[PDB]
Amino acid sequence: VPDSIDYRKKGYVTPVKNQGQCGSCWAFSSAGALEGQLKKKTGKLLALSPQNLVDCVTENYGCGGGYMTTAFQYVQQNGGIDSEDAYPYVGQDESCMYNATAKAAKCRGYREIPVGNEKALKRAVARVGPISVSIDASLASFQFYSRGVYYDENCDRDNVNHAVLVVGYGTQKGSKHWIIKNSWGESWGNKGYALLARNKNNACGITNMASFPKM
């Protein structure tokens, strides 16, 4: 468990995308976690289809929201998930179009991060890879984020509301941080990425609902 680590440098993270007007953050977060485990087990970085998950994860509500745990259950029970290329993202609800012959990744289950334990998340991020996490992204200070390590006293560390992807952790100008990838386009934040406060008492509830898939 090193003190610095950035899975973008290692070639584990696909380019930042934009979920648009669709409540599909859970699909992007879970897809990026699968993209990470596909890289670790295969060596190929292949963008996967969040649209696949939005349309076909019947226990979630598509653009009406969902959980990352259910997305992994889908890929497990369904026996695969298509690539972004074979099943591109459209930012809207539609009928399931899962193409089994074009599947690009499977999933043997998921393991949840213990609630509240940032050491455990750090441990998981170090041995596993990019981890899907839930945060409270509702504050304006998070919408207008630009630089530095984000910390805001008013961040609801009990009720989280948005999925992102932890692609590493480190330190910047003295403060420890998480490295999170968002799905709000490169025009948000820092080219689509942000730094969230680490070990500042579960800032924004980042460990309240974190998960990763097993391949």
Place this chain on the structure above:
Amino acid sequence: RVPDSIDYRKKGYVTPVKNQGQCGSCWAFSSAGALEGQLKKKTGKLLALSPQNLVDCVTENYGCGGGYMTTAFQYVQQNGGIDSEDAYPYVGQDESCMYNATAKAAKCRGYREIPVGNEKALKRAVARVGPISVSIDASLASFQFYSRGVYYDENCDRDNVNHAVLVVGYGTQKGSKHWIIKNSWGESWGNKGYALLARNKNNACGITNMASFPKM
């Protein structure tokens, strides 16, 4: 509580038969074949991997002058991957390691070996894992001129194997249990490149004498 018959060709786990030619690279076709099947299982895509990668680069083997499968599996683990047949096409001749880093097509996290002489074990391994690299006695003429049926020969040396093939299933044919094996001797050998070897008949041809598969 394990299936009576399985055929990984139907499941989309097996690439088409190849011909190793004059090069003695059966071990590389077998290992690459077990890795092909195990990549299909983990990810879902079937991609033919490069036996020439292994012939050239497994320096602890002798390239076209022979080798082991477990060694090939250990190379891809420590080397950190193996290229695909398209990126590293087969030539059937020794050459320098042209392994291409960024063209990683599959990875390997070790290997495991079948208990020697335990066909019951090999049966479970084929069912659970997938296609298993195995070693047989393929030196007899009866095997060279095999064409159909369940191969059995009382002279098949079940103590000293000499050739690597790839088990891709098992079952029964006319009431004789058998193993399904993919050879590396082209489609004009055997039954479009495959054969049925006698199963549960006292380790016929030493099939479980040196069987292994990779971990991903």
Place this chain on the structure above:
Amino acid sequence: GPRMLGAPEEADANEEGVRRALDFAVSEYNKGSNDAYHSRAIQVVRARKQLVAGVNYFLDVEMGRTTCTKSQTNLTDCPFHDQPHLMRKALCSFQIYSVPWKGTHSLTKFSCKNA
């Protein structure tokens, strides 16, 4: 229990984002009305918000015709019309997509009826 991520939720109509989505709806409403008089909001019957790449606002609002004209300058006081044939009512559904860091508002679904 713990809500779902990205799901719509009820919104307080006094937020600095709901008010701004409302003033946007009114502005596009007046531009989409053949009515001479400028129209303004009476009440918000329902306000829902949804977190996405930005925010979706789902506003069910009661609109009303005022006495002041569509193109007055000091459009800061505009009382509702008194006489029965001076006044008019409507219940409107707006879906507004806001991107705060781009400073944009967008009307994506719209539907008014009498009320």
Place this chain on the structure above:
Amino acid sequence: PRMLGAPEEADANEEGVRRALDFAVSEYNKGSNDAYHSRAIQVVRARKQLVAGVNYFLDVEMGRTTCTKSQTNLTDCPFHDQPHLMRKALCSFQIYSVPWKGTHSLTKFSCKNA
């Protein structure tokens, strides 16, 4: 254990090796430009390798014989007398055999003097 596809020493009396030696003799005469038939005295080292078929690595001592290059009584053809008329040679062959195709193929060969 033993490596798979590794060449190994072989007995020159084996059916496969005798068949490979005859092919080497025929190809040896086919491209010699000689007067008399020239067969093998003995095999001094034989190795076989298992592949898509069988590779044979043969070291043989050759020598010119009494019989002419084109006569059909090739069954009983002894060797010439003096070293001047014998032209002894130690040949090293390399034969790719594919039994289920009926194929024999001479990949490599050379001959020093003995």
